[PDB]
């Protein structure tokens, strides 16, 4: 299957999430896009929403944040500061095109999709929190583009309902991501084998949305069959934002890309053919040799035939058939047995 | 599957290959066994052979080594110096029990197996070079013990014959290892996907014999389904105590991060579902007003109606006065 011009069955699709790590600056946003391409990412993912896309402008208990940096402010106000403006989208997509990196966005409402259609995005991203919204999922499926869905909070019934919707809307490019929580979350809670379970149960392509640090999660995801890797990206390590705690800077993201690319090539082939190095080591494989001198007409036995290294003699499969036959030639001790010697 | 007292379906069986890294001194060998437990290995594997077990005492071209440290010497001479003497096995096995680590050996001839039977080994190891010897494989398979086999040089036909032999001799504990060559071997040449193919084609347990440095091969092997990791240990391609301990911790890190296939929501996943989408009143709604896009909005948090009701809810009438920002519930329509 293909995302834009990218074959995800040949290379792992590494996505750098621009997220809110532009810190409200278009200059930092454009600087981050070219650096993600320099880091080795294949696509940049921005978030397209307005506060109306996400929540309600209300003073009620449900809509005020508890305990965070916004310990008593509104959800509408939080999403306002972290929003990626519509005004930047023209420059963001064009800057990604100039740098050669792919670009797509994560919408959060119907209005964001209608705005995104003017860019004709190669793919769509459904965040974990919007996965249980069938009407939103159906609206994105009608776009007939590869859709990546985060399964962080979705139940199996909801994941099954997502599949039926994509089959209903005749959209075959559905990808499911396993989510890993950000530290101090423990490694035991990663459950990276859910990548395999997601592929088997729902017959979709699978990937990893990694909010953890290090190489354990992305490197194992490649081995587990994940073909899309998503990591949050920020240009600077002092660029404080709403996601700077679990994001990667240019150095760590480039290092993660190299770790994932090494895993890809180290996955190699299923074929059990003997490589050039394996054939060089097969010289010292077991083979049948003469463990004593054998005159013509003498019969072969355990006493004059021995399975030894190197492999220049008869293959050890001949041992039972060879035993009891008569030598056709004079065989000195240490001679490699050949066909015709018996 | 159980190897001795080790249950291989719960934990990855990490084997430290002592090989000839004792340098011909029993004092160094016993120190290596004590370090394997500190590194986190579950078993140490020694080699049981005499030069007769491997090759012939001959000066002919076939039996002289080319290009190594033994650039023109005999194969018989190399195996004589690198041998693990039979006299050491008793102390080696007794040291393994005292340190709490498992111990088994790699035989290379019939005579070596009969010597090992006095120790009742939990498992046997067939080196790659002996994998094409069906008479040797049949002899080891008849021991009815878990047998780990290196597929480094074995052909597909030979691997099938090993399975047929183990099926013939009714020994079901057959394990195949994928081999990775040592430096200068490239990462591209690893072909670690053969771990899965070995499991699929031959219906055996799979493992990794790693001669490479780093964590790429062992950590990926855990993800690929390997339940045996084999590494050479020394107190050129071996690992010291620090490198082996670092690899063991890396392998155990991979195990815990593998987790479950189960897709149930964990405690952390349930905490984040609070911020899932739900149906709320996006305007004030008087009793008897019909619901529409203008007065119903799917938003965060999740305290309102589940978004599945959006199609059914649209067009129905409110049964009560609903204010803006109110979570929609069953009975509001
Ligand atoms: Mn994320
Ligand atoms: Mn080895």
DSSP B48-84: E--HHHH-----SGGGB--SSTTTTSBHHHHHHHS--
Distance CA(B165)–CA(B159), nearest Å, equals: 10
CA distance A235 to chain B (A): 27
CA distance B178 to chain A (A): 10
Q: Helix (H, G, I), strand (E, B), or coil: what is residue B246?
A: helix
Helices (H), chain A: 26-39, 51-54, 75-82, 86-99, 110-116, 134-141, 156-168, 194-202, 216-223, 250-267, 276-281, 319-322
Distance CA(B103)–CA(B121), nearest Å, equals: 7
Which residue has 């074995």 as its token pair?
A: B154
- First vs last C-alpha separation in chain B: 58
CA distance B91 to chain A (A): 29
Which own/partner pairs from B234-238 qualify as long-range (CB within 8 Å, at least 24 positions apart)?
Answer: B234/B19, B234/B21, B234/B32, B235/B21, B235/B28, B235/B31, B235/B32, B235/B35, B236/B182, B236/B183, B237/B182, B237/B183, B237/B211, B237/B212, B237/B213, B238/B17, B238/B19, B238/B21
* Alpha-carbon dihedral sign for residues A259, A265, A271, A274: negative
Taking an 8 Å cut-off on Cβ atoms, the answer to whether A316 and B62 are in contact is no
Of A153, A279, A334, the closest CA to residue B181 belongs to A279
Taking an 8 Å cut-off on Cβ atoms, the answer to whether A269 and B194 are in contact is yes
The residues, any chain, with a CB within 8 Å of residue A120's CB and separated by 6 or more, are none
DSSP 8-state code for residue B152: S
Distance CA(A264)–CA(A9), nearest Å, equals: 11
Of B186, B239, B251, the closest CA to residue A266 belongs to B186
* Radius of gyration for chain A, computed over Cα atoms and rounded to the nearest angstrom: 30
Closest Cβ opposite residue A316 in set B62, B133, B156: B133
Q: Helix (H, G, I), strand (E, B), or coil: what is residue A78?
A: helix
Q: Write out residues 239-258 of A within 8 Å (CB-CB) of B.
A: none
Of A102, A131, A154, A127, the closest CA to residue A211 belongs to A127
Query: Any idea which ligand is nearest the CA of A125?
Result: 1
CA-angle at B288, arms to B282 and B289, nearest 5°:
35
Alpha-carbon distances of A225 from A99, A114, A215, B196, B202, rounded to whole Å: 29, 33, 16, 11, 21
* Alpha-carbon dihedral sign for residues A313, A317, A319, A323: negative
| Dihedral over alpha carbons A34, A179, B307, B284 (to 10 degrees) | -60
The experimental method, as deposited, was X-ray
Closest Cβ opposite residue B307 in set A133, A194, A307: A133
CA distance A54 to chain B (A): 5
Distance CA(A140)–CA(A147), nearest Å, equals: 8
Cβ-contact A110, A48 below 8 angstroms: no
Residues of B in contact with A211 (CB under 8 A): none
Taking an 8 Å cut-off on Cβ atoms, the answer to whether B263 and A188 are in contact is no
Query: Any idea which ligand is nearest the CA of B127?
Result: 2
Cβ-contact B148, B122 below 8 angstroms: no
Taking an 8 Å cut-off on Cβ atoms, the answer to whether A309 and B198 are in contact is no
Q: Provide the angle, in degrees to the nearest 10, between the axes of the packed helices A26-39 and A86-99.
A: 30
Distance CA(A337)–CA(A335), nearest Å, equals: 6
Query: Does B64 contact chain A (CB < 8 Å)?
Result: no
Q: Helix (H, G, I), strand (E, B), or coil: what is residue A17?
A: strand
Cβ-contact A305, B186 below 8 angstroms: no
What token pair was written down for A340?
């015709």
Query: Any idea which ligand is nearest the CA of A177?
Result: 1
Distance CA(B49)–CA(A317), nearest Å, equals: 22
Bridge pairing between strands B102-107 and B43-48:
parallel
Taking an 8 Å cut-off on Cβ atoms, the answer to whether B196 and A270 are in contact is yes
Alpha-carbon distances of A271 from A94, B192, B197, rounded to whole Å: 43, 10, 8
Distance CA(A29)–CA(B275), nearest Å, equals: 27
Query: Any idea which ligand is nearest the CA of A245?
Result: 1
Q: Which of B151, B191, B221 to mutate to test the interface with A (most CBs of A within 10 A)?
A: B191
- First vs last C-alpha separation in chain A: 58
A 10 A CB-CB count for B118 gives 10
Distance CA(B143)–CA(B173), nearest Å, equals: 11
Query: Does B129 contact chain A (CB < 8 Å)?
Result: yes
Alpha-carbon distances of A6 from A12, A260, B58, rounded to whole Å: 9, 17, 60
Taking an 8 Å cut-off on Cβ atoms, the answer to whether A277 and B189 are in contact is yes
Task: Tell me the sheet residues that pair with A148.
Answer: A125, A175
Cβ-contact B139, B110 below 8 angstroms: yes
**Burial annotation A26-57 (CB, 10 A radius, 16+ → b, else e):** eebbbebbbbbbebbbbbbbbbbbbbbbbbbe
A 10 A CB-CB count for B260 gives 12
Residues of B in contact with A278 (CB under 8 A): 152-153
Taking an 8 Å cut-off on Cβ atoms, the answer to whether A193 and B280 are in contact is no
Alpha-carbon distances of B66 from A280, A309, B63, rounded to whole Å: 12, 14, 10
CA distance A124 to chain B (A): 18
Alpha-carbon distances of A153 from A180, A247, B187, B262, rounded to whole Å: 11, 20, 37, 14
Distance CA(A187)–CA(A133), nearest Å, equals: 30
CA distance B176 to chain A (A): 12
Of B255, B220, B218, the closest CA to residue A264 belongs to B220
* Radius of gyration for chain B, computed over Cα atoms and rounded to the nearest angstrom: 30
Distance CA(A201)–CA(A218), nearest Å, equals: 22
Taking an 8 Å cut-off on Cβ atoms, the answer to whether B187 and A266 are in contact is yes
Taking an 8 Å cut-off on Cβ atoms, the answer to whether A281 and B136 are in contact is no
Distance CA(B46)–CA(B28), nearest Å, equals: 13
Alpha-carbon distances of A157 from A58, A160, A164, B261, B327, rounded to whole Å: 31, 5, 11, 16, 23
* Alpha-carbon dihedral sign for residues B216, B189, A266, A197: negative
Taking an 8 Å cut-off on Cβ atoms, the answer to whether B55 and A269 are in contact is no
* Alpha-carbon dihedral sign for residues A203, A205, A209, A210: positive
Size of interface A-B (CB pairs under 8 A): 236
Taking an 8 Å cut-off on Cβ atoms, the answer to whether B135 and A316 are in contact is yes
CA-angle at B129, arms to B123 and B133, nearest 5°:
80
Q: How many CA atoms lie within 13 A of A12 on its CB side?
A: 35
Q: Which of A138, A140, A186, A263 to mutate to test the interface with B (most CBs of B within 10 A)?
A: A263
Query: Does B56 contact chain A (CB < 8 Å)?
Result: yes
What token pair was written down for B263?
């897709």
Q: Tell me the residue length of chain B.
A: 333
The residues, any chain, with a CB within 8 Å of residue A66's CB and separated by 6 or more, are none
The alpha carbon of residue B283 and the mean position of all alpha carbons in its chain are separated, in whole angstroms, by 58
d(CA B68, ligand 2 centre) in Å: 17
Distance CA(B179)–CA(A110), nearest Å, equals: 53
Task: Tell me the sheet residues that pair with B148.
Answer: B125, B175
Helices (H), chain B: 26-39, 51-54, 75-81, 87-99, 110-116, 134-141, 156-168, 194-202, 216-223, 241-258, 267-272, 310-313
Query: Does B81 contact chain A (CB < 8 Å)?
Result: no
* Chain B: residue whose CA lies nearest to A129: B276
């Amino acid at each position: 299957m293909q995302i834009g011009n990218f074959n995800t069955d040949k290379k792992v699709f590494i996505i750098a999430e621009l997220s809110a790590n532009h810190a409200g600056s278009l200059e930092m946003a454009l600087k981050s896009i070219k650096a993600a391409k320099k880091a080795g990412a294949d696509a940049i993912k921005i978030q397209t929403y307005t506060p109306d896309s996400l929540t309600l402008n209300s003073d009620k208990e449900d809509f005020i944040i508890k305990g965070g940096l916004w310990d008593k402010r509104k959800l509408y106000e939080l999403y306002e500061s972290a929003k990626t403006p519509y005004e930047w989208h023209s420059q963001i997509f064009e800057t990604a095109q100039n740098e050669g990196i792919l670009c797509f966005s994560s919408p959060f409402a119907k209005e964001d999709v209608e705005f995104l259609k003017r860019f004709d995005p190669i793919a769509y991203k459904i965040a974990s929190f919007e996965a249980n919204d069938e009407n939103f999922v159906r609206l994105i499926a009608k776009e007939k583009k590869p859709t990546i869905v985060s399964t962080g909070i979705a139940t199996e019934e909801e994941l099954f309902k997502i599949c039926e919707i994509f089959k209903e809307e005749k959209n075959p490019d559905l990808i499911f991501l396993k989510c890993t929580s950000a530290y101090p979350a423990a490694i035991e809670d990663m459950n990276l084998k859910g990548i395999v379970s997601l592929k088997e149960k729902f017959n979709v392509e699978v990937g990893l949305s990694d909010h953890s640090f290090g190489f354990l999660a992305p490197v194992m995801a490649v081995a587990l069959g994940a073909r899309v890797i998503e990591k949050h990206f920020m240009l600077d390590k002092s660029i404080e934002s709403e996601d700077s705690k679990f994001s990667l800077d240019f150095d760590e993201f480039k290092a993660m890309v190299d770790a994932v690319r090494q895993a890809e090539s180290a996955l190699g082939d299923d074929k059990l053919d003997l490589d050039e190095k394996a054939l060089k080591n097969r010289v010292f494989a077991r083979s049948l040799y003469a463990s004593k001198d054998i005159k013509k007409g003498e019969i072969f036995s355990e006493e004059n035939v021995k399975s030894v290294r190197p492999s220049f003699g008869l293959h050890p499969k001949f041992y039972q058939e060879l035993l009891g036959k008569k030598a056709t030639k004079d065989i000195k001790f240490g001679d490699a047995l050949k066909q015709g010697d018996f």
